[PDB]
Design a protein around this ligand. Structure first.
Ligand code: FMN
Ligand code: SF4
Ligand code: SF4
Ligand code: SF4
Ligand code: FES
Ligand code: FES
Ligand code: CA
Lengths: 156, 905, 146
């Protein structure tokens, strides 16, 4: 089963205060559940639907529309490397090969111990410092393939 | 307006978009995402034409005709080379990921995508890469799901969510992995989910009941018929094959049910295909059951009926007008009884008096969608009259339509209309004993007993007009909500009052009549709508007769020694013990019916009547519109031993053999003339459809498509010699393809929509005067009565407040769309869909009984202790007990009756 | 808000204005203004057909104007230094300044505020510093990926 905690419900209600329609807090409610649990499980869709007063089909459509709302379980840290055009020119392929060799997984998959999940992302808005890669809260720029193992070690 | 298409000048409506304007003129533009009832969203990008700025423009610009208004002096080109190339490109793009599935796809030969792939002239595949695939969901017993075939046109979600008001079907995903369906495996929860099989232009949503016994559309024998499952009278196209009813398609009627049925009507036809139906006349002899043919049955029944001192007839609201009239002619007017209870008949007659003597216009089903405020009193419409609930949803969305029309936004630009009208809606006030399915859009819902709902109606009527009787003992908060309803109804330009005979209260109907009269007295353009129970409840009420209890007394006192029961199981309208005692006492029972009922064990003779698929006739819907349904197939064509005649034909030949000792298998039009001569109130059934001599330039109307196949091998297992084509003398249709089904044929009764190039249900566009409007040369069916010149008086009989007394439980009726209609219950696909019978209890009443949710309780009604598991109903009021009307053992006559000795089992 | 520049009765005028920050969920199509309106309402960010424009019926059907960060940052300079000052920044048909800059395999990739009419070779060979060592300039996109 699934049950929203008190803190999640309070945060969702406070976000509902900011809009004249409670539907407008669906993205932020999904992000609140994702912050507290790493991803949005199946019962969370119906829980958020019950809190907001909108159908669960609408919440599921929002949850599967946006890339940064995870509807499948992830690891403890989400590696998100930029694969867009400026980082392609700056050579993100070395970064992706280094991450694949270090983690022994394909993009979109998770390691055996659930430590890292590898994901390509869109442009991170840091094209003048590319190639960039956003781990859970921190964006790392000016990346080189030899600096990947020293950067992944600090994320236990 | 004036538009110039390909150098030719046309006059079109300026409020229309270019696609529907050009389709109305007969110009072929491919389209996927647009639907006449859903509006325009511009998703599929298939309707592209080239719009020029003026007459001397050469470059032009590719526009979407569904999103482009048909303004005055608009120059476009459909058959321009760039527009044709773009439309072919869009078809090719849809074809890149489409599966290689047409032989094993239920929409093959019926697919709008097939028709538009051929129409754009795209037949050469130059895409060589992998096709995206999808996994299907289980959507329940009715709708099969195959997401590979989706072209991402958003018709399903737009219909199901914006139009139908469902909540469990959305679009999930992204860029080209868009998925349509439910968030999880489960049954689609809408009562109108079955319209997805015609809304979807591909084979994603298909009729699973048709899929289990599948045949293509060209192999179907269709007929125009009327849905027999409730009182609304939606036009259907039943199609058969190999002697069994295969599918119910929607039949367009711009007045009644335009593009949409409900799921009861679409999926509750399976009782016709049951193997325990009577197929020959059966006469009992001691313990034996001798099978007779037609003439032997008529002679034997005529002899025994001639020897009997008085024969009485028990009609039914399931039977047609002709069959009830034929029974009335057989037994006499004074010996004819409507086979419904006295209270049911009293409510039906009061509803009739309100409709045809109240001086207030009763709207058609499509006209309901144009009203500015709705008050529903006592009628759980979604479970009894579901199409009216869909129409009410459209009338509620009318406020967003009006707000968008104030800002010069076109009425077809539906996304902008819904954006402007965010959550604003026209007022809806529903009253029921519990929660309805309309509560998600109702401005207010009143959960109360039928006495309290009637009192609320009388209070609304008094607050609208002080000449109406007042209600004493109204709580201040309830009075404030009364004032809210009064302010909403008084400010409305077109208020609508919907009641019916399903609440089980005469006073609810009286209160609705009082509200409608008070709104009429203020000058409002008010309409009233009564919802009856069965397909021909209104017709049986118009014809009239005694109640079932009177006939039971006649049989029990010995005054009647012969009874003819017509299409009536008799347990839904009276207690089964009393019916069994009266029928076992009577020395002659003759049952004319098409379903194996329980009273056939007491019958001396059983005449195998025809159902609606094997009979012709007329039924009167809840608004008083006479509608003719035509025979779909001859039952004797595949099985030569089957003697399954019309009920009116059986009864008319019985009357002839009783009088003159000769058998007369009459014609349908003779019975129609007899009805309009003997009963002047039913004189409008003559014009419901033309007679059997009607021809379109000399030829009849075809029941089956021109490409009907297997004509020399469908009966080849029985005999290699082809039999005769079945002669239809009753009607103007023929049992072959040797007939007329042109869209431009001067007729109203259309068996199926087909035009060259248009094989899907989008072929109805060619059969209408303008698309989404009336059927060309008028919709079939005529109103029996006009609006009266003067109205009724105020009903001063205000009921008292409901008082719960100990040891007496008022039965609150809970109707179910799947399970409260008898023949629908007989359909085997509804067994997996109908809920288990739960008895509804208040939390306080169950706490007083000590009963929890799920413990089986027993109650005694008519000396019969029956046990049901308890479901806790919060919205039910204390002292009431909720029962599923119509289901196994619980008759609809129990609605409003008291209950005794409700203990834990 | 603490200084009284936001909220109710801003600087004694009586104009009430409340400002919120809505963090997105990572989809590129949300940058389209009608799709931005749809995503602000908590829907799938499908863009909307025009007409009607957002100025007539935008967010929740109300009048709604969507502007970029840089446009709303250009506004206060116009309101503080006047109109003719803004028109007299550059002698071009596009008034005011613009955040320009080159990125990708150049010596100094970055962002600089330059008047309109500045040539791209000027930016590349003066602010970006040209291409790096052993690199021959082949092509360039002026305004991003699209
Ligand atoms: C696909 C697409 C993506 C867009 N992304 C952005 C964006 O990320 N940021 C932005 O300011 N405008 C974006 N726009 C432009 C907006 O539609 C709109 O012009 C702008 O946000 C506000 O207009 P303004 O330039 O007058 O301020 C995008 C447009 C399209 C078609
Ligand atoms: S949906 Fe239409 S085109 Fe697709 S497989 Fe079925 S019949 Fe063929
Ligand atoms: S499932 Fe059918 S109706 Fe829905 S978007 Fe796909 S093709 Fe259109
Ligand atoms: S609303 Fe009534 S008449 Fe219409 S399809 Fe449903 S059951 Fe049949
Ligand atoms: S292209 Fe990678 S940060 Fe912009
Ligand atoms: S029919 Fe016009 S774009 Fe779909
Ligand atoms: Ca016939």
């Amino acid at each position: 089963a699934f049950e929203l905690s008190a803190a999640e419900r309070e945060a969702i209600e406070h976000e509902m205060h900011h809009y004249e329609d409670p539907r407008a807090a669906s993205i932020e409610a999904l992000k609140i559940v994702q912050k507290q649990r790493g991803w949005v499980p199946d019962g969370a869709i119906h829980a958020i639907a019950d809190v907001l007063g909108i159908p669960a089909s609408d919440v599921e459509g929002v949850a599967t529309f946006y890339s940064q709302i995870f509807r499948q379980p992830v690891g403890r840290h989400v590696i998100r490397y930029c694969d867009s055009v400026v980082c392609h020119i700056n050579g993100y392929q070395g970064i992706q090969a280094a991450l694949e060799k270090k983690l022994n997984i394909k993009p979109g998959q998770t390691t055996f111990d659930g430590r890292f999940t590898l994901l390509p992302t869109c442009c991170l808005g840091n094209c003048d410092k590319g190639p960039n890669m956003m781990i859970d809260e921190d964006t790392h720029a000016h990346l080189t393939p030899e600096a990947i193992p020293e950067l992944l070690e600090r994320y236990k | 307006a004036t538009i110039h298409v390909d150098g030719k000048e046309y006059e079109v409506n300026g409020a229309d978009n270019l696609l529907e304007a050009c389709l109305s003129l007969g110009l072929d533009i491919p389209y996927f995402c647009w639907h006449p009832a859903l509006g325009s969203v511009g998703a599929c990008r298939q309707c592209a034409v080239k719009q020029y700025q003026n007459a001397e423009d050469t470059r032009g610009r590719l526009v979407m005709s569904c999103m482009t208004p048909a303004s005055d002096g608009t120059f476009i080109s459909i058959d321009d080379e760039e527009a044709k190339q773009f439309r072919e490109s869009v078809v090719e793009w849809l074809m890149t990921n489409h599966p290689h599935d047409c032989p094993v796809c239920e929409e093959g030969g019926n697919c709008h995508l097939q028709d538009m792939t051929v129409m754009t002239g795209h037949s050469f595949r130059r895409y060589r890469f992998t096709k995206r695939t999808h996994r299907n969901q289980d959507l329940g017993p009715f709708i099969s799901h195959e997401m590979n075939r989706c072209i991402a046109c958003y018709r399903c979600v737009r219909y199901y969510k914006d139009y139908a008001g469902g909540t469990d079907l959305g679009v999930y995903g992204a860029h080209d992995n868009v998925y349509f369906g439910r968030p999880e495996d489960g049954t689609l929860e809408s009562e109108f989910s079955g319209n997805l099989v015609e809304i979807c232009p591909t084979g994603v949503f298909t009729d699973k009941t048709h899929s289990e016994r599948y045949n293509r559309k060209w192999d179907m024998q269709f007929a125009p018929s009327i849905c027999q499952q409730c009182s609304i009278g939606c036009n259907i196209s039943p199609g058969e094959r190999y002697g069994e009813l295969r599918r119910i398609e929607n039949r367009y009627n711009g007045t009644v049910n335009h593009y949409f049925l409900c799921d009861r009507g679409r999926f509750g036809y399976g009782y016709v295909n049951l193997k325990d139906r009577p197929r020959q006349p059966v006469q009992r002899r001691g313990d034996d059951f001798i099978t007779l043919n037609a003439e032997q049955a008529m002679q034997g029944a005529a002899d025994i009926l001639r020897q009997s001192k008085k024969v009485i007839g028990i009609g039914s609201p399931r039977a047609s007008v002709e069959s009830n009239f034929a029974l009335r002619e057989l037994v006499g007017e004074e010996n004819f009884y409507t086979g419904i209870a006295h209270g049911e008949q009293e409510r039906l007659q009061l509803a009739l008096k309100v409709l045809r003597e109240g001086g207030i216009y009763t709207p058609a089903l499509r006209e309901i969608e144009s009203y500015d405020a709705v008050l529903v009193l006592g009628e759980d419409v979604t479970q009894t009259g579901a199409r009216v609930a869909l129409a009410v949803r459209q009338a509620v969305k009318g406020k967003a339509r009006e707000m968008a029309a104030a800002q010069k936004v076109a009425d077809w630009q539906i996304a902008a209309i819904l954006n402007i009208g965010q959550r604003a809606k026209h007022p809806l006030f529903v009253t029921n004993v519990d929660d309805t399915r309309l509560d998600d859009i109702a401005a207010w819902t009143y959960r109360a007993p039928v006495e309290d709902q009637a009192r609320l109606g009388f209070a609304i009527a008094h607050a609208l007009d002080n000449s109406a009787p007042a209600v004493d003992g109204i709580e201040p908060e309830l009075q404030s909500k009364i004032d809210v309803i009064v302010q909403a109804l008084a400010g409305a330009k077109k208020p609508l009052i919907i009641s019916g005979t399903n609440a089980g209260s005469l006073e609810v109907i009286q209160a609705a009549a009082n509200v409608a009269k008070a709104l009429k007295g203020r000058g409002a353009d008010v309409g009233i709508t009564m919802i009856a129970r069965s397909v021909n409840s209104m017709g049986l009420g118009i014809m009239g007769g005694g109640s079932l209890e009177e006939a039971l007394t006649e049989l029990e006192t010995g005054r009647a020694d012969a009874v003819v029961v017509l299409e009536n199981d008799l347990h839904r309208h009276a207690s089964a013990t009393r019916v069994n005692a009266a029928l076992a006492k009577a020395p002659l029972v003759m049952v004319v019916d098409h379903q194996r009922t329980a009273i056939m064990e007491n019958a001396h003779l059983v005449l195998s009547a025809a159902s609606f698929a094997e009979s012709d006739g007329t039924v009167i819907n809840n608004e008083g519109r006479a509608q003719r349904f035509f025979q779909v197939y001859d039952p004797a064509y595949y099985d030569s031993k089957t003697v399954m005649l019309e009920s009116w034909r059986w009864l008319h030949s019985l009357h002839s053999t009783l009088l003159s000792r000769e058998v007369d298998w009459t014609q349908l039009d003779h019975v129609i003339d007899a009805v309009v001569a003997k009963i002047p109130e039913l004189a409008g059934i003559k014009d419901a459809a033309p007679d059997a001599t009607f021809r379109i330039r000399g030829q009849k109307l075809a029941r089956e498509p021109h490409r009907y196949s297997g004509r020399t091998a469908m009966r080849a297992n029985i005999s290699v010699h082809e039999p005769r084509q079945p002669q239809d003398i009753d009607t103007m249709f023929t049992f072959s393809m040797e007939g007329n089904n042109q869209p431009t044929a001067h007729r109203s009764q259309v068996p199926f929509a087909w035009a060259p190039g248009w094989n899907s249900p989008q072929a109805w566009n060619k059969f209408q005067d303008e698309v989404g409007g009336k059927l060309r040369f008028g919709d079939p069916g005529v109103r029996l009565f006009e609006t009266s010149e003067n109205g009724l008086d105020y009903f001063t009989s205000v009921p008292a407040r409901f008082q719960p007394q100990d040891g007496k439980w008022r039965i609150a009726p809970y109707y179910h769309l799947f399970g409260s209609d008898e023949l629908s219950q007989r359909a085997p696909v509804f067994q997996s869909r109908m809920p288990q019978p739960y008895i509804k209890l208040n939390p306080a009443d169950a706490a007083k009984l000590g009963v929890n949710a799920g413990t089986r309780v027993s109650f005694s009604y008519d000396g019969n202790t029956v046990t049901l598991p308890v479901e806790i109903a919060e919205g039910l009021t204390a002292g009431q007990v909720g029962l599923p009307m119509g289901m196994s053992g619980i008759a609809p006559v129990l609605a409003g009756a008291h209950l005794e000795d409700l203990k834990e089992a | 808000t603490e200084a009284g520049l936001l909220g109710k009765n801003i600087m004694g005028t009586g104009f009430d204005f409340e400002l919120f920050v809505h963090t997105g969920a990572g989809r590129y199509i949300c940058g389209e203004e009608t799709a931005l309106i749809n995503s602000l309402e908590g829907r799938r960010a499908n863009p909307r057909s025009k007409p009607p424009f957002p100025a007539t019926s935008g967010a929740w059907g109300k009048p709604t104007c969507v502007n970029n960060v840089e446009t709303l940052c250009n506004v206060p300079a116009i309101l503080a230094n006047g109109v003719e000052w803004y028109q007299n920044i550059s002698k071009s048909k596009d008034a005011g300044t613009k955040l320009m800059g080159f990125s990708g395999r150049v010596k100094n990739p970055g962002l600089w505020e330059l008047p309109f009419g500045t040539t791209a070779r000027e930016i590349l060979e003066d602010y970006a510093g040209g291409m790096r060592d052993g690199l021959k300039f082949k092509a360039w996109q002026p305004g991003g990926a699209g």
